[PDB]
């Protein structure tokens, strides 16, 4: 029947959305990780470097 043609096209459009939606949210997740790590690796070097320059200073002052 004409009934199942419409049903086909319908169910399938949901199929396409599960997978695609999932990927884009995976990218968004991905993009979260990527930034978090980059900003962290910059930041934990930063603090150490300051504690270095200021450190040699404390030696020199000794």
């Amino acid at each position: 029947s004409k009934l199942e043609a419409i049903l086909s096209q319908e169910v399938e459009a949901e199929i396409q959305a599960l997978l695609q939606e999932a990927e884009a949210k995976a990218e968004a997740v991905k993009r979260e990780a990527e930034e978090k790590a980059k900003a962290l690796l910059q930041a934990r070097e930063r603090a150490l470097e300051a504690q270095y320059r200021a450190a040699l200073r404390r030696a020199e002052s000794a």
Binding site: S8, E14, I15, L18, A26
Partner: protein
Amino acid sequence: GLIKSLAEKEKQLLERLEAAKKEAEERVKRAEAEAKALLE
């Protein structure tokens, strides 16, 4: 009536939809592993 015909097709479609859900939620769980690894 045709009915039966039309009453079988409605299962097949649905299980193609099923197949979609799994691989979908799985991709997020793939990226979940990666986020973890990538931060650790």
